[PDB]
Design a protein around this motif. Sequence first.
Motif, PDB file in Angstrom:
ATOM      1  N   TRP A 163      -2.964  25.769 -38.792  1.00  0.00           N
ATOM      2  CA  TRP A 163      -3.164  24.620 -37.914  1.00  0.00           C
ATOM      3  C   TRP A 163      -3.648  23.431 -38.730  1.00  0.00           C
ATOM      4  N   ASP A 219     -22.469   7.100 -43.364  1.00  0.00           N
ATOM      5  CA  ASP A 219     -21.980   8.479 -43.484  1.00  0.00           C
ATOM      6  C   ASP A 219     -23.035   9.545 -43.742  1.00  0.00           C
ATOM      7  N   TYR A 251     -15.233  39.296 -35.559  1.00  0.00           N
ATOM      8  CA  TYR A 251     -15.562  37.948 -35.115  1.00  0.00           C
ATOM      9  C   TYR A 251     -16.916  37.952 -34.407  1.00  0.00           C
ATOM     10  N   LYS A 291     -21.184  15.616 -29.418  1.00  0.00           N
ATOM     11  CA  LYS A 291     -21.686  16.821 -30.062  1.00  0.00           C
ATOM     12  C   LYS A 291     -23.071  17.196 -29.547  1.00  0.00           C
ATOM     13  N   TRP A 319     -12.473  23.919 -38.996  1.00  0.00           N
ATOM     14  CA  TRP A 319     -13.286  24.937 -38.352  1.00  0.00           C
ATOM     15  C   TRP A 319     -12.800  26.305 -38.792  1.00  0.00           C
ATOM     16  N   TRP A 346     -14.455  19.488 -46.834  1.00  0.00           N
ATOM     17  CA  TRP A 346     -13.540  18.861 -45.894  1.00  0.00           C
ATOM     18  C   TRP A 346     -12.918  17.724 -46.690  1.00  0.00           C
ATOM     19  N   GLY A 399     -15.208  14.829 -48.655  1.00  0.00           N
ATOM     20  CA  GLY A 399     -15.654  13.553 -48.099  1.00  0.00           C
ATOM     21  C   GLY A 399     -17.064  13.153 -48.503  1.00  0.00           C
ATOM     22  N   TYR A 454      -8.018  12.506 -43.191  1.00  0.00           N
ATOM     23  CA  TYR A 454      -8.738  13.096 -42.069  1.00  0.00           C
ATOM     24  C   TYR A 454      -7.908  14.011 -41.194  1.00  0.00           C
TER      25      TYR A 454
HETATM   26  O1  LIG Z   1      -8.225  21.425 -33.923  1.00  0.00           O
HETATM   27  C1  LIG Z   1      -6.894  21.312 -34.361  1.00  0.00           C
HETATM   28  C2  LIG Z   1      -6.068  22.412 -33.760  1.00  0.00           C
HETATM   29  O2  LIG Z   1      -6.942  23.562 -33.525  1.00  0.00           O
HETATM   30  C3  LIG Z   1      -6.158  24.702 -32.947  1.00  0.00           C
HETATM   31  O3  LIG Z   1      -7.006  25.830 -32.697  1.00  0.00           O
HETATM   32  C4  LIG Z   1      -7.300  26.482 -33.935  1.00  0.00           C
HETATM   33  C5  LIG Z   1      -8.703  26.075 -34.362  1.00  0.00           C
HETATM   34  O4  LIG Z   1      -9.578  26.177 -33.213  1.00  0.00           O
HETATM   35  C6  LIG Z   1     -10.834  25.562 -33.408  1.00  0.00           C
HETATM   36  C7  LIG Z   1     -11.693  25.816 -32.198  1.00  0.00           C
HETATM   37  O5  LIG Z   1     -12.037  27.233 -32.200  1.00  0.00           O
HETATM   38  C8  LIG Z   1     -12.843  27.672 -31.044  1.00  0.00           C
HETATM   39  O6  LIG Z   1     -13.168  29.051 -31.111  1.00  0.00           O
HETATM   40  C9  LIG Z   1     -12.112  29.952 -30.705  1.00  0.00           C
HETATM   41  C10 LIG Z   1     -11.079  30.208 -31.792  1.00  0.00           C
HETATM   42  O7  LIG Z   1     -10.164  29.092 -31.947  1.00  0.00           O
HETATM   43  C11 LIG Z   1     -10.207  31.386 -31.494  1.00  0.00           C
HETATM   44  O8  LIG Z   1      -9.332  31.679 -32.600  1.00  0.00           O
HETATM   45  C12 LIG Z   1     -11.036  32.619 -31.245  1.00  0.00           C
HETATM   46  O9  LIG Z   1     -10.232  33.668 -30.934  1.00  0.00           O
HETATM   47  O10 LIG Z   1     -11.893  32.344 -30.071  1.00  0.00           O
HETATM   48  C13 LIG Z   1     -12.837  31.272 -30.385  1.00  0.00           C
HETATM   49  C14 LIG Z   1     -13.791  31.166 -29.235  1.00  0.00           C
HETATM   50  O11 LIG Z   1     -13.134  30.566 -28.154  1.00  0.00           O
HETATM   51  C15 LIG Z   1     -14.128  26.890 -31.034  1.00  0.00           C
HETATM   52  O12 LIG Z   1     -14.897  27.240 -29.868  1.00  0.00           O
HETATM   53  C16 LIG Z   1     -13.865  25.438 -31.068  1.00  0.00           C
HETATM   54  O13 LIG Z   1     -15.158  24.788 -31.161  1.00  0.00           O
HETATM   55  C17 LIG Z   1     -13.006  25.029 -32.239  1.00  0.00           C
HETATM   56  O14 LIG Z   1     -12.669  23.651 -32.124  1.00  0.00           O
HETATM   57  C18 LIG Z   1     -13.139  22.944 -33.275  1.00  0.00           C
HETATM   58  O15 LIG Z   1     -14.576  22.617 -33.150  1.00  0.00           O
HETATM   59  C19 LIG Z   1     -15.052  22.015 -34.397  1.00  0.00           C
HETATM   60  C20 LIG Z   1     -16.532  21.804 -34.224  1.00  0.00           C
HETATM   61  O16 LIG Z   1     -16.687  21.056 -33.046  1.00  0.00           O
HETATM   62  C21 LIG Z   1     -18.074  20.852 -32.710  1.00  0.00           C
HETATM   63  O17 LIG Z   1     -18.735  19.808 -33.554  1.00  0.00           O
HETATM   64  C22 LIG Z   1     -18.100  18.484 -33.356  1.00  0.00           C
HETATM   65  C23 LIG Z   1     -17.985  18.084 -31.874  1.00  0.00           C
HETATM   66  O18 LIG Z   1     -17.084  16.980 -31.772  1.00  0.00           O
HETATM   67  C24 LIG Z   1     -17.474  19.187 -30.997  1.00  0.00           C
HETATM   68  O19 LIG Z   1     -17.628  18.803 -29.601  1.00  0.00           O
HETATM   69  C25 LIG Z   1     -18.188  20.469 -31.240  1.00  0.00           C
HETATM   70  O20 LIG Z   1     -17.596  21.491 -30.426  1.00  0.00           O
HETATM   71  C26 LIG Z   1     -14.284  20.712 -34.647  1.00  0.00           C
HETATM   72  O21 LIG Z   1     -14.686  20.394 -36.001  1.00  0.00           O
HETATM   73  C27 LIG Z   1     -14.975  19.021 -36.198  1.00  0.00           C
HETATM   74  O22 LIG Z   1     -13.719  18.276 -36.371  1.00  0.00           O
HETATM   75  C28 LIG Z   1     -13.933  16.849 -36.592  1.00  0.00           C
HETATM   76  C29 LIG Z   1     -12.590  16.198 -36.690  1.00  0.00           C
HETATM   77  O23 LIG Z   1     -12.008  16.379 -35.425  1.00  0.00           O
HETATM   78  C30 LIG Z   1     -10.851  15.578 -35.320  1.00  0.00           C
HETATM   79  O24 LIG Z   1      -9.788  16.093 -36.209  1.00  0.00           O
HETATM   80  C31 LIG Z   1      -9.387  17.467 -35.851  1.00  0.00           C
HETATM   81  C32 LIG Z   1      -9.043  17.603 -34.358  1.00  0.00           C
HETATM   82  O25 LIG Z   1      -9.003  18.994 -34.021  1.00  0.00           O
HETATM   83  C33 LIG Z   1     -10.061  16.968 -33.463  1.00  0.00           C
HETATM   84  O26 LIG Z   1      -9.525  16.957 -32.109  1.00  0.00           O
HETATM   85  C34 LIG Z   1     -10.412  15.581 -33.859  1.00  0.00           C
HETATM   86  O27 LIG Z   1     -11.528  15.164 -33.065  1.00  0.00           O
HETATM   87  C35 LIG Z   1     -14.821  16.657 -37.821  1.00  0.00           C
HETATM   88  O28 LIG Z   1     -15.164  15.275 -37.764  1.00  0.00           O
HETATM   89  C36 LIG Z   1     -15.125  14.643 -39.038  1.00  0.00           C
HETATM   90  O29 LIG Z   1     -16.310  15.018 -39.801  1.00  0.00           O
HETATM   91  C37 LIG Z   1     -16.211  14.454 -41.153  1.00  0.00           C
HETATM   92  C38 LIG Z   1     -17.408  14.945 -41.934  1.00  0.00           C
HETATM   93  O30 LIG Z   1     -18.598  14.633 -41.266  1.00  0.00           O
HETATM   94  C39 LIG Z   1     -16.132  12.923 -41.099  1.00  0.00           C
HETATM   95  O31 LIG Z   1     -15.829  12.581 -42.466  1.00  0.00           O
HETATM   96  C40 LIG Z   1     -16.414  11.426 -43.009  1.00  0.00           C
HETATM   97  O32 LIG Z   1     -15.723  10.278 -42.430  1.00  0.00           O
HETATM   98  C41 LIG Z   1     -16.221   9.038 -43.015  1.00  0.00           C
HETATM   99  C42 LIG Z   1     -15.426   7.954 -42.331  1.00  0.00           C
HETATM  100  O33 LIG Z   1     -15.699   8.029 -40.953  1.00  0.00           O
HETATM  101  C43 LIG Z   1     -15.031   6.980 -40.245  1.00  0.00           C
HETATM  102  O34 LIG Z   1     -13.567   7.134 -40.285  1.00  0.00           O
HETATM  103  C44 LIG Z   1     -13.153   8.414 -39.694  1.00  0.00           C
HETATM  104  C45 LIG Z   1     -13.703   8.571 -38.276  1.00  0.00           C
HETATM  105  O35 LIG Z   1     -13.347   9.887 -37.818  1.00  0.00           O
HETATM  106  C46 LIG Z   1     -15.175   8.308 -38.189  1.00  0.00           C
HETATM  107  O36 LIG Z   1     -15.631   8.269 -36.807  1.00  0.00           O
HETATM  108  C47 LIG Z   1     -15.506   6.995 -38.807  1.00  0.00           C
HETATM  109  O37 LIG Z   1     -16.918   6.797 -38.776  1.00  0.00           O
HETATM  110  C48 LIG Z   1     -15.877   9.069 -44.492  1.00  0.00           C
HETATM  111  O38 LIG Z   1     -16.275   7.833 -45.058  1.00  0.00           O
HETATM  112  C49 LIG Z   1     -16.600  10.215 -45.141  1.00  0.00           C
HETATM  113  O39 LIG Z   1     -16.244  10.219 -46.539  1.00  0.00           O
HETATM  114  C50 LIG Z   1     -16.239  11.510 -44.493  1.00  0.00           C
HETATM  115  O40 LIG Z   1     -17.074  12.578 -44.992  1.00  0.00           O
HETATM  116  C51 LIG Z   1     -15.008  12.493 -40.197  1.00  0.00           C
HETATM  117  O41 LIG Z   1     -15.185  11.077 -39.960  1.00  0.00           O
HETATM  118  C52 LIG Z   1     -15.088  13.139 -38.869  1.00  0.00           C
HETATM  119  O42 LIG Z   1     -13.945  12.791 -38.069  1.00  0.00           O
HETATM  120  C53 LIG Z   1     -16.091  17.464 -37.697  1.00  0.00           C
HETATM  121  O43 LIG Z   1     -16.838  17.421 -38.935  1.00  0.00           O
HETATM  122  C54 LIG Z   1     -15.851  18.917 -37.411  1.00  0.00           C
HETATM  123  O44 LIG Z   1     -17.068  19.659 -37.169  1.00  0.00           O
HETATM  124  C55 LIG Z   1     -12.799  20.929 -34.618  1.00  0.00           C
HETATM  125  O45 LIG Z   1     -12.010  19.706 -34.670  1.00  0.00           O
HETATM  126  C56 LIG Z   1     -12.324  21.691 -33.420  1.00  0.00           C
HETATM  127  O46 LIG Z   1     -10.910  21.961 -33.559  1.00  0.00           O
HETATM  128  O47 LIG Z   1      -9.193  26.898 -35.494  1.00  0.00           O
HETATM  129  C57 LIG Z   1      -9.139  28.349 -35.256  1.00  0.00           C
HETATM  130  C58 LIG Z   1      -7.724  28.739 -34.826  1.00  0.00           C
HETATM  131  O48 LIG Z   1      -7.775  30.113 -34.475  1.00  0.00           O
HETATM  132  C59 LIG Z   1      -7.241  27.941 -33.669  1.00  0.00           C
HETATM  133  O49 LIG Z   1      -5.861  28.311 -33.418  1.00  0.00           O
HETATM  134  C60 LIG Z   1      -5.446  24.314 -31.655  1.00  0.00           C
HETATM  135  O50 LIG Z   1      -4.576  25.400 -31.253  1.00  0.00           O
HETATM  136  C61 LIG Z   1      -4.657  23.059 -31.781  1.00  0.00           C
HETATM  137  O51 LIG Z   1      -4.262  22.614 -30.448  1.00  0.00           O
HETATM  138  C62 LIG Z   1      -5.427  21.954 -32.446  1.00  0.00           C
HETATM  139  O52 LIG Z   1      -6.453  21.523 -31.544  1.00  0.00           O
END
Ligand SMILES: OC[C@H]1O[C@@H](O[C@H]2[C@@H](OC[C@H]3O[C@@H](O[C@H]4[C@H](O)[C@@H](O)[C@H](O)O[C@@H]4CO)[C@H](O)[C@@H](O)[C@@H]3O[C@@H]3O[C@H](CO[C@H]4OC[C@@H](O)[C@H](O)[C@H]4O)[C@@H](O[C@@H]4O[C@H](CO[C@H]5OC[C@@H](O)[C@H](O)[C@H]5O)[C@@H](O[C@@H]5O[C@H](CO)[C@@H](O[C@@H]6O[C@H](CO[C@H]7OC[C@@H](O)[C@H](O)[C@H]7O)[C@@H](O)[C@H](O)[C@H]6O)[C@H](O)[C@H]5O)[C@H](O)[C@H]4O)[C@H](O)[C@H]3O)OC[C@@H](O)[C@@H]2O)[C@H](O)[C@@H](O)[C@H]1O
Length: 747
Positions: free
Chosen positions: A291, A445, A340, A493, A316, A374, A394, A262
């Motif tokens: 990243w 899931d 973009y 979300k 993402w 993913w 996944g 993950y």
């Molecule tokens: O993020 C890391 C890194 O990012 C760096 O920045 C870079 C990055 O930026 C991303 C952001 O971009 C923003 O736009 C900017 C852009 O960056 C910039 O370049 C441009 O110029 O300007 C733009 C405009 O401003 C954008 O606005 C942001 O939104 C974006 O941030 C990302 O948003 C994604 C989507 O988020 C939305 O949906 C989800 C909500 O939670 C949010 O509130 C919403 O906004 C988000 O994607 C999701 O990630 C999660 C995982 O997140 C976790 O891991 C990564 C971490 O970053 C994060 O903090 C942390 O929370 C995914 O969740 C997973 O989903 C899968 C599939 O469904 C699950 O899998 C299944 O699991 C089960 C088992 O489950 C159990 O066990 C696990 C447990 O987790 C679960 O609860 C249990 O039940 C398994 O059995 C199955 O088999 C399996 O399928 C899994 O469980 C689950 O966890 C989710 O799916 C995604 O949608 C992103 O995390 C978020 O980052 O990219 C561009 C680059 O330019 C940037 O530089 C930073 O600099 C750095 O600091 C750092 O943060």
Amino acid sequence: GMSEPYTWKSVVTGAGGGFVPGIIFNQTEPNLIYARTAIGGAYRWNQATSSWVSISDSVGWVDWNKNGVDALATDPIDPNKVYMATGTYTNHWDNNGQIMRSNDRGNTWQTTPLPFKVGGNMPGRSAGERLVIDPNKNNILYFGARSGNGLWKSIDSGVTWSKVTSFPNVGTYIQNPTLDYGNDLVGLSWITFDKSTGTLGNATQTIYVGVADTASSVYRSTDGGVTWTALAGQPTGFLPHHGELSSTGDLYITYSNGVGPYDGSKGEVWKYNKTSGAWTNISPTTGTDNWYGFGGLALDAQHPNTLMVSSLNAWWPDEVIFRSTNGGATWSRIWDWGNYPERTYKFSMDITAAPWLDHGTTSTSLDPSPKLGWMMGDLEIDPFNSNRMMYGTGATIYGSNNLTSWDTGGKVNISVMAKGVEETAVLGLISPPTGTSHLITALGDVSGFRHEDLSVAPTKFQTSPSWATTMSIDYAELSPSYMVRVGSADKEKTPSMKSIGISNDGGVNWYMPNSEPSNGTKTTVGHGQVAVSASGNSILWSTSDIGVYYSKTSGNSWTASAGLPAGAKIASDRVNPNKYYGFYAGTFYVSVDGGATFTATGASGFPTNNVAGLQPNEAQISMKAVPGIEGDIWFAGGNTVENKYGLWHSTNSGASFTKLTNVEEADLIGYGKAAPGQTYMSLYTVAKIDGVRGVFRSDDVGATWVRINDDAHQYAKINMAITGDPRIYGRVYLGTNGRGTLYADPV
Ligand SMILES: OC[C@H]1O[C@@H](O[C@H]2[C@@H](OC[C@H]3O[C@@H](O[C@H]4[C@H](O)[C@@H](O)[C@H](O)O[C@@H]4CO)[C@H](O)[C@@H](O)[C@@H]3O[C@@H]3O[C@H](CO[C@H]4OC[C@@H](O)[C@H](O)[C@H]4O)[C@@H](O[C@@H]4O[C@H](CO[C@H]5OC[C@@H](O)[C@H](O)[C@H]5O)[C@@H](O[C@@H]5O[C@H](CO)[C@@H](O[C@@H]6O[C@H](CO[C@H]7OC[C@@H](O)[C@H](O)[C@H]7O)[C@@H](O)[C@H](O)[C@H]6O)[C@H](O)[C@H]5O)[C@H](O)[C@H]4O)[C@H](O)[C@H]3O)OC[C@@H](O)[C@@H]2O)[C@H](O)[C@@H](O)[C@H]1O
Ligand SMILES: OC[C@H]1O[C@@H](O[C@H]2[C@@H](OC[C@H]3O[C@@H](O[C@H]4[C@H](O)[C@@H](O)[C@H](O)O[C@@H]4CO)[C@H](O)[C@@H](O)[C@@H]3O[C@@H]3O[C@H](CO[C@H]4OC[C@@H](O)[C@H](O)[C@H]4O)[C@@H](O[C@@H]4O[C@H](CO[C@H]5OC[C@@H](O)[C@H](O)[C@H]5O)[C@@H](O)[C@H](O)[C@H]4O)[C@H](O)[C@H]3O)OC[C@@H](O)[C@@H]2O)[C@H](O)[C@@H](O)[C@H]1O
Ligand SMILES: [Cl-]
Ligand SMILES: [Cl-]
Ligand SMILES: [Mg+2]
Ligand SMILES: [Mg+2]
Ligand SMILES: [Mg+2]
């Protein structure tokens, strides 16, 4: 005891619905492919039908941990031979693992216990492979183990195992040092022979081993595994997921700053030339453009300088696959940014085999649906066809048969390649007595599906509400178009999403009610169990966190039920809409006011799960009232620690139960259509009866039982869900924890 032969088939989901951490191609026989899963055993591919068959269904109740397949090896000298390292957890949730061996491609197995635990469902399970066969001398196998156990070897084709004491690094990285899950060493990560350093019949002399230790992660022996040395000049600071050797002598290594599946927020890719000794950083992205770790690593067997890697995990807007034809000197991305937020794509997703993979959302460039993937820890190119790749996500196995279109300016067509795979964990099952569906599931899931033809994938993901896991579903017995499911909404979300969904059309469409259970301080996070009154005029929700609530207002309001403990199991009477049943910690309860008030009854002998170290809210309990008979309830469950285990029957609304004397242990009960000439519904149970663990049917109210599964169709720890079919005599629906849902009929 008595047995009746049945035909066991999977209820088809099309995509499988769980994580595939490893896909393993045989290196000498075309189209011989295996896939391994974390909780659902392993599979072998069938090229003629483009589908997978499970090779794990002999795994049963006591040896359930064998369905955690942490590693798999397929013999290149005798491709009938295959081996697995199995065992599911390395913490206190599991016992020791084993090496399993087969000489018939997984049709049958023998097993050798290991004196330590294997981690098929632990962190780092997509690094590998960690079990390998010497490609020049196939009685030699190596296994890289978890938790500090280091490197192990067999010289007798997997029968006997011994520690390689000359291996000098058992790992240093720990994913979750403060948790009770994954606080052990990840250990060794992958093993790779250099086949050119042996000849047929003579041990391969050069062996490479990756180790989860950021300070020193890549080891080599050049004397057949007698002496082991860290590779001079190797990079530090990351964890190598895979190491693959090209015929050029370049050893390619993907690295992440985690072991996955993950995480991974920084990564590198390197190559090391075995003849010159040069190290080159060939990372596809770097700096702020990186990243994520790099996970999957696929070399092209036909074109020695062609390879691909996948991100693990960018998250993402989607993951990225990168392809190089010059040994990593330059890379092409499978998609790029335009202006973009626009993107350009070198791939197209086809999920017609499992249309629900769109999760019911509208695709956009920033929120693509379906995603490329993913948890892409394993990525493979067919060694006999550079146009075919497969990778695990996944949720499924994706693949293509026109991969080299990438190199000629075309688009790679990626499609679901998981036919035959079923991985879901089944939290509940209902078989409605009317309507076009005989089966609606509650799944981890991927939420659950309304099935019509059990050979056709569901067309729709469950939405409004949309969540990951449905814990419980029930229907109104007298109006089966009315049904209710409960799960756990992701309110970060979608803050307006509720954890309960209601349908008035038999589960085709859902809506969310206007309120949820809450107290003065908080609204429920959901989960728990739900029961629907016989007529649908009320709902009872035993939430996971804040106790039991009822609604007589279609969820417009919820009121805490008096007298029933938080965490109670619940069940509605199927005839009398005023009547519900509850159970907790050994005490049985009844409500005759529609779930508002519960009073204890006198029922004795039920597992309290509350003496000698047992916990009440984690008991194994199956409790259901019988369609068509008010006050008729069956109860299965218990454990041997309390000597309270079996199957109980009440016909007086729970005032008293008879414990069936002919059932030694039971864990689930369900009902189906009565046998010809009988009036009482057939009973289906998961039980130990007449000394035999299995699945049993009674057509005479439990007087006699016949086993309807067999030793080849056991499906590991089947304590999840069961029901008969009120419209089909003999039909059973069996839930599992990692094998999806089965349906079976007499032969
Ligand atoms: O993020 C890391 C890194 O990012 C760096 O920045 C870079 C990055 O930026 C991303 C952001 O971009 C923003 O736009 C900017 C852009 O960056 C910039 O370049 C441009 O110029 O300007 C733009 C405009 O401003 C954008 O606005 C942001 O939104 C974006 O941030 C990302 O948003 C994604 C989507 O988020 C939305 O949906 C989800 C909500 O939670 C949010 O509130 C919403 O906004 C988000 O994607 C999701 O990630 C999660 C995982 O997140 C976790 O891991 C990564 C971490 O970053 C994060 O903090 C942390 O929370 C995914 O969740 C997973 O989903 C899968 C599939 O469904 C699950 O899998 C299944 O699991 C089960 C088992 O489950 C159990 O066990 C696990 C447990 O987790 C679960 O609860 C249990 O039940 C398994 O059995 C199955 O088999 C399996 O399928 C899994 O469980 C689950 O966890 C989710 O799916 C995604 O949608 C992103 O995390 C978020 O980052 O990219 C561009 C680059 O330019 C940037 O530089 C930073 O600099 C750095 O600091 C750092 O943060
Ligand atoms: O600290 C725990 C931590 O876990 C995180 O989740 C990770 C963890 O998930 C375990 C569950 O994995 C499912 O499989 C996934 C699979 O990992 C994916 O690759 C695939 O794609 O999807 C699958 C399905 O979603 C399994 O379906 C689950 O069964 C498993 O749950 C754990 O199961 C074990 C084993 O028990 C079962 O199997 C054998 C059988 O005998 C038994 O009857 C079955 O129930 C449970 O062990 C028992 O634990 C209790 C104590 O439990 C308490 O403490 C741990 C908490 O997790 C519990 O909720 C809590 O009640 C103990 O008294 C018993 O003696 C044990 O038998 C575990 O309790 C179940 O959790 O590992 C895989 C990884 O992929 C997940 O990310 C989670 O995200 C964190 O929030 C956190 O909870
Ligand atoms: Cl544009
Ligand atoms: Cl009908
Ligand atoms: Mg079969
Ligand atoms: Mg692989
Ligand atoms: Mg669609």
